[PDB]
Every structure is written in C-alpha cells, then in structure tokens.
Amino acid sequence: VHHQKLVFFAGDVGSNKGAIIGLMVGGVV
Amino acid sequence: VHHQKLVFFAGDVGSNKGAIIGLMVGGVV
Amino acid sequence: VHHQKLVFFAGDVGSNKGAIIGLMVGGVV
Amino acid sequence: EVHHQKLVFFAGDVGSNKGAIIGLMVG
Amino acid sequence: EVHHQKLVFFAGDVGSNKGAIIGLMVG
Amino acid sequence: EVHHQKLVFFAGDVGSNKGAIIGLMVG
Amino acid sequence: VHHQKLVFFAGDVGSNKGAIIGLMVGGVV
Amino acid sequence: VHHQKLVFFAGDVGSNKGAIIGLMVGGVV
Amino acid sequence: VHHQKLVFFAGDVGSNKGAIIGLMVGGVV
Amino acid sequence: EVHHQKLVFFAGDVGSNKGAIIGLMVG
Amino acid sequence: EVHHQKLVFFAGDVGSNKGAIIGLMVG
Amino acid sequence: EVHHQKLVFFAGDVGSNKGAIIGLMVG
C-alpha cells in the first residue's frame, strides 16, 4: 500500500479559507 | 495498490473556500 | 491497480467554493 | 447516539430575531 | 451521547436580537 | 455526555442585542 | 403645503439594503 | 412650505446598508 | 421654508453601513 | 464634461484576472 | 473635465491577478 | 483636469498579485 503526493500544487496558492486534505478517513472538517 | 498525484494542479490556485481532497473514504467535509 | 492524475488541471484555477476530489469512496462532502 | 454532523446556517443577513435560534439542543 | 459536531451560524450581519440565540443547550 | 464540538457564531456585525446570547448553557 | 409622516414604521425594521425615501423629486438613487 | 417627520421610525432599526433619505431633490446616492 | 425632523428615529439604531441623509440636494454619496 | 457618477463593480468574488480592469480611464 | 465620482470595486475576494488593475488612469 | 474622486478597492482578500495594481497613475 503506497500513498504519495495525493494532492500536488506545482504553482502558487494564493489564499485558503476552506479545507485541503490529503487523505480523509474520519472526523468532521 | 498505488495511489499517486490523484489531484494535480500544474498552474496557480487563486482562492479555495471549498474542499480539495485527494482520497475521500469517510467522515463529513 | 494503478490510480494516477485522476483530476488534472494544466492551467490556473481561479476560485473553488465547491468540491474537488480525486477518488470518492465514502462519506459526505 | 447522534454523531458526525456539520451544520452551516445563515450565510446572508438576518434582520430581526424576536424568537429562538438554537444550534444544538440536547434533552 | 452527542459528539463530533461542527456548527457555523451567521456568516453575514444580524440587525437586532430581542429573543434568544444559544450555541449549545444541554438539559 | 456531550463532547467534541466546534461552534463559530457571528462572522459579520451584530447591530443590537436586547435579549440573550449564550455560547454554552449546562443545566 | 403640509407634508407629514409620509413613510411611517410603527414596528421594527430588521435590515435595509435598498432605499427608503420620504419625498423623491429628483436625482438618482 | 412645511415638511416634518417625512420618514418616521417608531421602533428599532437593526442595520442599514442602503439609503434612508428624508427629502431627495438632486445628486446620486 | 420650514424643514424639521425629516428623518426621525424614536428607537435605537444598531449599525449603519449605508447613508442616512436629512435633505439631499447635490453631490455623490 | 463628465461628472456625478457612482460605480459599484464586483460584489462577489473574481477568480482570475489575466487582462485589464480599470475604474476610470481619461484620455 | 472629469469630476465628482465614487468607485467601489471588489467587495469579495480576488484569487489571482496576473494582469493590470488600475483605479484611476489619466493620460 | 481630474478632481474630487473617492475610490474603495478590494474589501475582501487578494490571494496572489503577479501583475500590477496601481491606485492613481498620472501621465
């Protein structure tokens, strides 16, 4: 089982007001 | 089982107010 | 089993207020 | 048993409240 | 048993409250 | 038993409160 | 010759995002 | 010749984001 | 010839983010 | 002669500008 | 002659500017 | 002749500027 670079941003990210999650298994975001 | 670069952004991302998730298995976003 | 670059953005992304998910198996978004 | 909820209420303006507004009421 | 909740209430303006606004009420 | 909550209330302005605003009320 | 209480609010006004004008003779609102 | 109480609020006003004008003769609001 | 109490607030005013003008003859608001 | 204007542009979000956005251009 | 203007631009968010944004440009 | 202006630009957030943003440009 190999998980790598599941979300990849090659450029810039200006503003995050939401959620950025690699792997989401449980909980509330 | 090989998961790589499931969401890939080659350019810029201005603003995120929502969700960006690689792999979504459970929970509430 | 090989999952790669399931959602690919070659240009820019201005604003996300919704969901961008690579692979969606369970949960509520 | 009540668990794992997200609630997003009132994205715009609310003029007047003369009653009750309650997020979570238990019992 | 009540657990794991997120509540986001009133993203804009509220003019007037003359009643009750309660986040979490237990018992 | 009530546990693990996040509450975000009133992101904008509130003009006037003449009633009650309570975060968490126990008993 | 006598203008009085042309707009009368006996109760409460929650929010105004528009125009409330007594007497409108010229201009742009 | 007599202008009085052209806009009358007997109760409370919660929030104003617009215009409240007694008498509007010229200009831009 | 007599202008009096053109806008009258008998109760409270919570917040103003707009304009409250008695008499508007020229200009930009 | 150009006078007495009010301009309210872009009440929501703008994702991306790659061109020109100009309030007032004279000459 | 250009006079008496009010300009209210961009009430929400702007993600990315890669071009030009100019309030007032004279000549 | 350019006179008597009010400019209110960018009430929310700006993520990224890679270009130009100029209030007033004369000549």
Residue numbers in the entry:
A (entry chain A), B (entry chain A), C (entry chain A), G (entry chain C), H (entry chain C), I (entry chain C): 12 to 40
D (entry chain B), E (entry chain B), F (entry chain B), J (entry chain D), K (entry chain D), L (entry chain D): 11 to 37
Which text from the study accompanies this structure?
The Arctic mutation, encoding E693G in the amyloid precursor protein (APP) gene [E22G in amyloid-β (Aβ)], causes dominantly inherited Alzheimer’s disease. In summary, we report the structures of Aβ filaments from a case of AD with the Arctic mutation and from mouse knock-in line AppNL−G−F. These findings have implications for our understanding of AD pathophysiology. Comparison of local conformations in this region revealed the presence of additional hydrogen bonds between adjacent Aβ molecules in mutant protofilaments; these hydrogen bonds cannot form in wild-type protofilaments, providing a plausible explanation for the increased fibrillogenesis of E22G Aβ. Mutation E22G may have an additional fibrillation-promoting effect, which is the relief of electrostatic repulsion as a result of removal of the negatively charged carboxylic group of E22; in the wild-type structure, E22 is trapped in close proximity to the carboxylic group of D23.
Most filaments, solved to 2.0 Å resolution, are made of four mutant protofilaments, with two copies each of non-identical protofilaments A and B. The ordered cores of protofilaments A and B, hereafter referred to as the human Arctic folds A and B, consist of residues V12–V40 and E11–G37, respectively. Each fold comprises four β-strands (β1–β4) that extend from residues 12 to 15, 18 to 21, 30 to 32 and 34 to 36 in fold A, and from residues 11 to 13, 14 to 19, 30 to 32 and 34 to 36 in fold B. Human Arctic fold A is almost identical to the fold of type II protofilaments of wild-type Aβ42, but it is shorter by two C-terminal amino acids. The substructures that are common to folds A and B form a dimeric and pseudo-symmetric interface that is centered on residues G25 and S26 from both folds and is stabilized by salt bridges between D23 from one fold and K28 from the other fold, and vice versa. These doublets of protofilaments A and B pack together with C2 symmetry to form the tetrameric filaments. The interface between doublets is also stabilized by two salt bridges, between the main chain carboxyl group of the C-terminal residue V40 from protofilament A in one doublet and the side chain of K16 from protofilament B in the other doublet, and vice versa. Our high-resolution cryo-EM maps of Aβ filaments with the Arctic mutation showed the absence of side chain densities at G22, unlike the corresponding maps for wild-type Aβ filaments. In the majority of filaments, half of the protofilaments (human Arctic fold A) are made of Aβ40, with the terminal carboxyl group of V40 contributing to the protofilament interface, whereas the other half (human Arctic fold B) may contain a variable number of residues after G37. In these dimeric filaments, the terminal carboxyl group of A42 contributes to the protofilament interface. These findings establish that the parenchymal deposits of E22G Aβ differ from those of wild-type Aβ by the presence of abundant Aβ40 filaments.
